[PDB]
Write an enzyme that holds these catalytic residues in place. Structure first.
Site, PDB file in Angstrom:
ATOM      1  N   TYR C 100       1.914  16.182   8.094  1.00 56.04           N
ATOM      2  CA  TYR C 100       1.451  16.927   9.265  1.00 56.04           C
ATOM      3  C   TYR C 100       1.171  15.962  10.436  1.00 56.04           C
ATOM      4  O   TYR C 100       0.013  15.712  10.800  1.00 56.04           O
ATOM      5  CB  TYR C 100       0.206  17.744   8.905  1.00 56.04           C
ATOM      6  CG  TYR C 100       0.489  18.745   7.814  1.00 56.04           C
ATOM      7  CD1 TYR C 100       1.377  19.816   8.030  1.00 56.04           C
ATOM      8  CD2 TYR C 100      -0.101  18.620   6.550  1.00 56.04           C
ATOM      9  CE1 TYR C 100       1.671  20.744   7.004  1.00 56.04           C
ATOM     10  CE2 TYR C 100       0.187  19.532   5.531  1.00 56.04           C
ATOM     11  CZ  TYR C 100       1.080  20.580   5.757  1.00 56.04           C
ATOM     12  OH  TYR C 100       1.337  21.483   4.736  1.00 56.04           O
ATOM     13  N   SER C 120      -3.712   9.894   9.731  1.00 55.03           N
ATOM     14  CA  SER C 120      -3.736   8.541   9.122  1.00 55.03           C
ATOM     15  C   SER C 120      -2.363   7.908   9.169  1.00 55.03           C
ATOM     16  O   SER C 120      -1.947   7.220   8.239  1.00 55.03           O
ATOM     17  CB  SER C 120      -4.188   8.632   7.678  1.00 55.03           C
ATOM     18  OG  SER C 120      -3.158   9.174   6.851  1.00 55.03           O
ATOM     19  N   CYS C 151      -0.660   0.980   9.338  1.00 50.57           N
ATOM     20  CA  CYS C 151      -1.272  -0.248   8.853  1.00 50.57           C
ATOM     21  C   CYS C 151      -0.710  -1.421   9.630  1.00 50.57           C
ATOM     22  O   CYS C 151      -1.439  -2.252  10.095  1.00 50.57           O
ATOM     23  CB  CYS C 151      -1.001  -0.402   7.348  1.00 50.57           C
ATOM     24  SG  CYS C 151       0.727  -0.103   6.926  1.00 50.57           S
ATOM     25  N   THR C 152       0.606  -1.492   9.744  1.00 46.23           N
ATOM     26  CA  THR C 152       1.281  -2.611  10.396  1.00 46.23           C
ATOM     27  C   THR C 152       0.860  -2.794  11.855  1.00 46.23           C
ATOM     28  O   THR C 152       0.633  -3.934  12.288  1.00 46.23           O
ATOM     29  CB  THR C 152       2.775  -2.459  10.332  1.00 46.23           C
ATOM     30  OG1 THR C 152       3.143  -2.341   8.951  1.00 46.23           O
ATOM     31  CG2 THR C 152       3.470  -3.634  10.963  1.00 46.23           C
ATOM     32  N   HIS C 178       6.254  -6.188   3.343  1.00 47.24           N
ATOM     33  CA  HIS C 178       5.350  -5.104   3.083  1.00 47.24           C
ATOM     34  C   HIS C 178       5.465  -4.622   1.623  1.00 47.24           C
ATOM     35  O   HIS C 178       6.545  -4.481   1.078  1.00 47.24           O
ATOM     36  CB  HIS C 178       5.669  -4.007   4.088  1.00 47.24           C
ATOM     37  CG  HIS C 178       4.615  -2.950   4.180  1.00 47.24           C
ATOM     38  ND1 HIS C 178       4.315  -2.118   3.121  1.00 47.24           N
ATOM     39  CD2 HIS C 178       3.793  -2.595   5.194  1.00 47.24           C
ATOM     40  CE1 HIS C 178       3.316  -1.323   3.465  1.00 47.24           C
ATOM     41  NE2 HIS C 178       3.002  -1.572   4.729  1.00 47.24           N
ATOM     42  N   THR C 181       5.067   1.513  -1.331  1.00 50.29           N
ATOM     43  CA  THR C 181       4.149   2.631  -1.181  1.00 50.29           C
ATOM     44  C   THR C 181       4.606   3.843  -1.938  1.00 50.29           C
ATOM     45  O   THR C 181       5.688   3.863  -2.533  1.00 50.29           O
ATOM     46  CB  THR C 181       4.019   3.082   0.308  1.00 50.29           C
ATOM     47  OG1 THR C 181       5.252   3.670   0.751  1.00 50.29           O
ATOM     48  CG2 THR C 181       3.625   1.942   1.161  1.00 50.29           C
ATOM     49  N   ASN C 315      -2.849  -3.229   3.535  1.00 55.90           N
ATOM     50  CA  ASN C 315      -2.343  -2.018   4.152  1.00 55.90           C
ATOM     51  C   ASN C 315      -3.092  -0.758   3.693  1.00 55.90           C
ATOM     52  O   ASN C 315      -3.264   0.198   4.461  1.00 55.90           O
ATOM     53  CB  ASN C 315      -0.806  -1.925   3.958  1.00 55.90           C
ATOM     54  CG  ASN C 315      -0.363  -2.200   2.522  1.00 55.90           C
ATOM     55  OD1 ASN C 315      -0.227  -3.388   2.111  1.00 55.90           O
ATOM     56  ND2 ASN C 315      -0.086  -1.102   1.751  1.00 55.90           N
TER      57      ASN C 315
END
Ligand SMILES: NC(=O)c1ccc[n+]([C@@H]2O[C@H](COP(=O)([O-])OP(=O)(O)OC[C@H]3O[C@@H](n4cnc5c(N)ncnc54)[C@H](O)[C@@H]3O)[C@@H](O)[C@H]2O)c1
Ligand SMILES: NC(=O)c1ccc[n+]([C@@H]2O[C@H](COP(=O)([O-])OP(=O)(O)OC[C@H]3O[C@@H](n4cnc5c(N)ncnc54)[C@H](O)[C@@H]3O)[C@@H](O)[C@H]2O)c1
Ligand SMILES: NC(=O)c1ccc[n+]([C@@H]2O[C@H](COP(=O)([O-])OP(=O)(O)OC[C@H]3O[C@@H](n4cnc5c(N)ncnc54)[C@H](O)[C@@H]3O)[C@@H](O)[C@H]2O)c1
Ligand SMILES: NC(=O)c1ccc[n+]([C@@H]2O[C@H](COP(=O)([O-])OP(=O)(O)OC[C@H]3O[C@@H](n4cnc5c(N)ncnc54)[C@H](O)[C@@H]3O)[C@@H](O)[C@H]2O)c1
Lengths: 336, 336, 336, 336
Positions: C100, C120, C151-152, C178, C181, C315
């Protein structure tokens, strides 16, 4: 007057033994490692890939390692006979290099001034102890050099003791699915003594021999002839699991097995054997100080007399705590 | 009459150099490794975690390794000066131990009977060659001991040559995201010369120094002062990637960069530099024999004069093929 | 009166945001996740492969999650419009489902009773904030729905701000190495939108696009046109690193770069940007609450105007803390 | 006239089944997968993280997949009932989605025009077959929809058949140390049906239930009540191992066990069961087409009546071949 400790070999076990000692208020007076100078020791001790940053202060000065304001002499000797144990006043020595396993090889510490030695591995001939199982077999007057067995033996022996005393083990075969260790390789390389152990540790399920199941029958003699086993090394950096398949004398419905393990955990083996019914996986035991954590829901029974029992262990951290508990026990008894 | 080869150090590169030699019909007459006896060599050569089983026959007899019916003498010497190269008739020696990097250290092979030496790593002083870039700098009469650079240098130099000749490199900075290697550790252990390299290889992104980008400026002198870089070691067993961020003199729209790389790949650098537009990831280059595989879609431009170029390499397999191509080239030229 | 929070999507971020909220004394009044019933939420919250067991008590009763005696309503709704935010009294909602992302999609929370929403992740259109960089651009009266970036971006923006304000960034190109995830796969599977992201996460270095470097020019508009970048996904479960290659306007000897970063870390960016000279690797930042940890020794300069700067970030954990810091900041400002 | 095949679900098994079919000259006439359009199917088929690039040509045109000049219709249907099997002339369908396991669920293929269905997994109710063990139990006139069991069952059943027929299995308990699969997660996420399977696949040893050992007593009914087992999922992408701990009726010195297995491998189970005495690890079985590879040196006996037997399997590749062998067998028998 007080337990003082020296550590030979500041590796996984040496360093985590030092952590365990700090957590348990045990005085470490020296560390020897020929490959790690004091400033580098600070780094190696403070940062840990598996167990996080040391919670406390770590520094060096004056050729010493300073952990939480406790000063630790650092030596850089390649052989036990070279180490100045007399300088720090006859400490109890943890022999954690992996290369000095016999009574003969270890005794050079005694001649270099060590009061006692605990070999952090099984020995061909040193007497062998598992806290919670046979530590009362220790004889202050006649055992200067002992072994604290292997991580795997410290996991299996407590479980095997409980199951055997309650149901009778007719016969058993163990597999440990075990994290890789320092003796393994990052990529396929030489391991002349055990070819499979040379194969890349991160890439492979690797079958390996282990004497750990048999070693249980040395610390619980009534199991002689009734236990053996093998290992698989797998791509995890720490935490291992024991899978004991056993044939039992008395009927052992699984609910009865659980009641026995829980009672042992809550009483005579508190701190050594733990009991869980949660849906755990290996990372859940990182930093766990128990020798053996029985996983109620992972095990399976074919019938009341043939069962597969599952128990976890942090092979680095749990074992390191047992080294410290064995040192402390030896010292209270050596006051006799 | 014919190129004959000896390999010192039957490790990742030594073994895959032998595979490359078999694939390319190059006669290997001896392997020396003090830690691997002939029967164990068969095992190490036949089974490979990364590159699969050897497709062919591998056996031993009479203190020899037999690959596809070709017999290879096996020696077990700890130092180059001890190795009997005269016995197998002055072969071209691949020095792949990682420990004999200087002209001085390597020259003990020449005195032990080697015709030439190719050091499978950068040297502090041996002249350095990247096939497809400066191999014509080799001088048969004055260069007994050469270096074939590093895997990373063999990836960057061909790309850097093409980009520089077409657009002009004003300045560049390289990162290589690189698979772990044999010098690394399975768990946090000692690496006194480079502390970070001791940290568990399977658990960590590890920054490391590398001279590889600078080494490009030795093999392409016109880039002197214009290139340097560093590495990250990551938890993959093989295959690495170069990420070259460069400022370019002439306008370099990305479509123009691609046309230059494709033309180089199809012509003057066929077999050394390859060009792809597929949606590749590292495993896609396992076993690839190219030095450098330009990844068109992975790269990104800020503008026509500042770009990030991406190129892959199988650091074990590609490099090993270049060792063999360099040996063959040296030999055709040494017929002068 | 007080900041109250609801979390939609109890995933990596959602759960660690709850951990951050407990650590920081911020009241979480509800969690919505359609795939996690309360009893299961206890388990997922309590045990964590990457960040260890929750230090505190976790239980359920009455269709609630109870963390350290604080009761949390649990909802099980598949769509924001279905969630009863009014029932727990107009909380600030963290939108951490990953699905969303737009103002339009997230505004269904507002009409379902949420006072505010913090997405987020980057948004195509919600205004975007990085704590320590542009949080003062938040307008209590006109911004119901905001983004906390990636995060980055939270790692790059603070460093870029320091470097730009001291030396001037002419142009820059970023790579982030990275950790994998939740959007990635265990083995090669379907990722129709981004084919490479379907390839096995544990087996591969995977190139990926990221808007994160451009996003920094949204939060620092003076960098517009001057920054972009890409990513490599690698086989570690958490902790990532930024590698910023940049051309600087004023001379920037590396010693000067380090003083600028240290002075920012000690002062205006305390808690957001940290500075280290230790020989760190990625596991060293597990659980670190900073947005950006500048690694002094890992960086390299070609010259005073062309440098590669290296900065780490957890992260998962660092970002989750920034969500909570942004919530707390929004609330103090919404009192206007 | 000829065996023609359709594949529903072009995943690990589906794709490797197509590879097996090409290797074995079996005509695949269509692939259905709703999440993979033809052009993407080329990519997924061509490049494989675990099994290397497809050796051959792969292209698309006209809404078809073209593998080595054989054209394959591609459909994109989310449900079996939607798939146009009639259009490609009543093929034998491989049901490899993981979601249509029952007779009832799979029978929608038959009404959509499929001649037969082989479910690439155990079924609650379809009859179950292991090539080399009970394929002769197949009845052409009464079994439209069958199951080819699991990878694990295909490994255990052939070994169990040999051991039982030679020595008598009194009772047995199995563990499989098993590579992670597509149902697992990259990081801790939701697995409501089996909580442990949600935990990060790359980080953990994960205990799991499996019906695979019991399933062997379905295909060898004389073992009813005598076999069960469980699993550990570990951080390798492919290849698994069976560890069978069993009590045997007749004395079974290990030398006798090895002769029984070797004689089965050479004769009645050629291609299904293999025998090795090499020092193998898991990567050594990548691409191996056998159902079961007995590892002579990895096993251990307590005595002549109580043994642990170890046997490997490429869970992806071996199983996929067995799907194709079962298809081919079904077809020769359906000519009756
Ligand atoms: N890691 C575990 O899970 C575990 C558990 C139980 C027992 N053990 C045993 O503990 C012993 C140590 O294991 P580890 O995992 O710490 O290995 P490690 O490689 O981490 O420890 C070896 C350390 O000793 C040092 N060393 C080497 N030779 C030396 C010498 N001659 N003198 C002094 N120091 C020397 C090395 O620098 C290294 O720091 C081994 O016998 C191992 O079998 C390990
Ligand atoms: N692996 C790569 O990706 C790669 C690429 C390019 C260059 N290199 C370089 O190649 C050299 C070898 O690297 P590797 O990855 O094969 O390492 P490795 O550890 O796999 O190779 C070392 C081999 O040499 C043997 N050895 C050690 N000391 C010896 C001695 N004194 N005499 C004879 N043999 C000895 C060891 O048994 C081992 O088998 C190193 O300089 C490395 O930097 C490696
Ligand atoms: N993990 C990181 O490093 C990181 C860092 C910064 C930002 N983010 C962003 O945070 C967002 C979430 O990331 P994550 O790593 O926690 O993902 P995740 O997959 O771990 O968490 C997603 C959660 O959302 C739930 N969910 C799915 N659909 C839902 C719905 N309709 N309603 C409510 N819940 C639903 C799932 O059950 C799961 O618990 C993504 O946009 C991601 O890009 C992730
Ligand atoms: N991988 C192994 O080791 C292994 C071994 C033996 C048996 N199996 C079984 O094979 C079956 C598939 O396993 P896998 O590992 O290939 O899984 P996978 O996730 O790799 O493959 C599943 C494929 O099915 C597709 N799919 C999903 N829903 C679909 C639908 N409704 N219609 C058509 N396609 C759909 C997905 O796009 C994907 O390509 C499962 O039952 C699994 O238990 C797997």
């Amino acid at each position: 007057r007080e337990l003082t400790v020296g550590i030979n070999g500041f590796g996984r076990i040496g360093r985590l033994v030092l952590r365990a000692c700090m957590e348990k208020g045990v005085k470490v007076v020296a560390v020897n490692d020929p490959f790690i100078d004091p400033e580098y020791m600070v780094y190696m001790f403070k940062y840990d890939s598996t167990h996080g940053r040391y919670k406390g202060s770590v520094e060096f000065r004056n050729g010493q390692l300073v952990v939480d304001n406790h000063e630790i002499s650092v030596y850089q000797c390649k052989e036990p006979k070279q180490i100045p144990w007399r300088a720090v006043g006859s400490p109890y020595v943890v022999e954690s290099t992996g290369v000095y396993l016999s009574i003969q090889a270890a005794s050079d510490h005694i001649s270099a001034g060590a009061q006692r030695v605990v070999i952090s591995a099984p020995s061909p001939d040193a007497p062998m102890f598992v806290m919670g199982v046979n530590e009362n077999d220790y004889n202050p007057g006649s055992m200067n050099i002992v072994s604290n067995a292997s991580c795997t033996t410290n996991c299996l022996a407590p479980l095997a003791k409980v199951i055997h005393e309650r149901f009778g083990i007719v016969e058993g075969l163990m597999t440990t699915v075990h994290s890789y260790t320092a003796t393994q390789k990052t990529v396929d390389g030489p391991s002349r003594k055990a070819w499979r152990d040379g194969r890349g540790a991160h890439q492979n399920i690797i079958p390996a021999s282990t004497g750990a199941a048999k070693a249980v029958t040395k610390v619980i003699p009534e199991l002689k002839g009734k236990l053996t086993g093998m290992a698989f090394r797998v791509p995890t950096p720490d935490v291992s699991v024991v899978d004991l398949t056993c044939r039992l004398a008395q009927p052992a419905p699984y609910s009865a097995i659980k009641e026995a393990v829980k009672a042992a955990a809550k009483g005579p083996m508190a701190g050594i054997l733990a009991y869980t019914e949660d849906e755990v996986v290996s990372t859940d035991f990182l930093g766990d100080t128990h020798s053996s954590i029985f996983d109620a829901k992972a095990g399976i029974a074919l019938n009341d007399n043939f069962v597969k029992l599952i128990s976890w262990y942090d092979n680095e951290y749990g074992y390191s705590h047992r080294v410290v508990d064995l040192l402390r026990y030896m010292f209270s008894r050596d006051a006799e």
